[PDB]
Design a protein around this ligand. Structure first.
Ligand SMILES: Cc1cc2nc3c(=O)[nH]c(=O)nc-3n(C[C@H](O)[C@H](O)[C@H](O)COP(=O)(O)OP(=O)(O)OC[C@H]3O[C@@H](n4cnc5c(N)ncnc54)[C@H](O)[C@@H]3O)c2cc1C
Length: 262
């Protein structure tokens, strides 16, 4: 019996809270028992909530999935107060999570989502089903973890030959999430995945792209459309609508059919 039940809010207890960097924390939440299946299909996420002094809820794709029993890990960017001048109050739920102590609980509802990569080289999107050979992934900031979950499900499977191209955009090089992990995946599956990065404001020793995602960047980093090739996207709404879809549409993709948003 899996932990996730889409009809229920299920309590999960914080087991470990481990700093990845000054503003990125890994939260390790226990399931009902240490051998329990999470029950999160590839392509889906969860809603995590807590009642504080007001019920606050946000979507998260854990960096672990069904392969890890008894717990799930969340990698969370903490949007701290009095750091950014445009956002002096910071992020509501990421600070709630950061303030948690081991032993505190959150409520979890899931699985959530319309896209399901259900078996090697195959997916379901709402009511539509199809074989797939190549997947483009475009992520911005925290939009990375839905991509990371799919990349691991494909690359760690000894019977899946699906190829991947990731294009990951962030404001600064310091904002890139899971960079060592992404680099280690590209290093350990060199003929199956490529990863390309862009930052708004780069430093002199930067070996990748600068500025917003454009047609040239999409053509360098991603596959063009052919039957069997899809593009999946997760990031800030303006980035997707204005920088991604127009350029994928020029590369032969179709919004909602071959270009799918998480
Ligand atoms: C499918 C899915 C999966 C996700 N997975 C993850 C994941 O694994 N990890 C993760 O960290 N997030 C993930 N997110 C994002 C998550 O849902 C939240 O939006 C995020 O945690 C921020 O919420 P918040 O309550 O802290 O910020 P809010 O209070 O909702 O603030 C709104 C926005 O203000 C901006 N902002 C506020 N303060 C600052 C600041 N100090 N500096 C810069 N910008 C600021 C941010 O862009 C923020 O998103 C995912 C989202 C989706 C839809």
């Amino acid at each position: 019996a899996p932990f996730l039940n889409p009809k229920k809010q299920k309590a999960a207890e914080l087991k470990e809270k481990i700093k990845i960097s000054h503003d990125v924390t890994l939260f390790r939440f226990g399931l009902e028992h240490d051998e329990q299946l999470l029950g999160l299909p590839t392509g889906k996420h969860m809603l995590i909530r807590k009642k504080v002094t007001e019920v606050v809820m946000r979507a998260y794709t854990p960096t672990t999935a069904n392969e890890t029993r008894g717990h799930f890990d969340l990698v969370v960017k903490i949007y701290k107060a009095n750091v950014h001048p445009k956002f002096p109050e910071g992020g509501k739920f990421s600070q709630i999570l950061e303030a948690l102590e081991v032993g505190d609980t959150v409520e979890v509802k899931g699985p959530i989502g319309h896209f399901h990569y259900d078996r090697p080289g195959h997916y379901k999107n709402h009511k539509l089903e199809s074989e797939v050979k190549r997947i483009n992934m475009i992520a911005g900031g925290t939009g990375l973890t839905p991509m990371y979950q799919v990349m691991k499900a494909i690359l760690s499977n000894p019977s899946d030959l699906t190829e991947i191209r990731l294009l990951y955009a962030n404001q600064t090089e310091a904002d890139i999430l899971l960079r060592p992990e992404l680099e280690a995946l590209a290093k350990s599956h060199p003929d199956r995945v490529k990863i390309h990065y862009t930052v708004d404001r780069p430093t002199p020793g930067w070996k990748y792209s600068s500025g917003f995602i454009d047609l040239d960047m999409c053509e360098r980093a991603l596959f063009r459309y052919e039957p069997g090739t899809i593009s999946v996207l997760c990031g800030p709404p303006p980035m997707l609508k204005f920088a991604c879809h127009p350029n994928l549409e020029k590369m032969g993709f179709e919004k909602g059919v071959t270009s799918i948003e998480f």
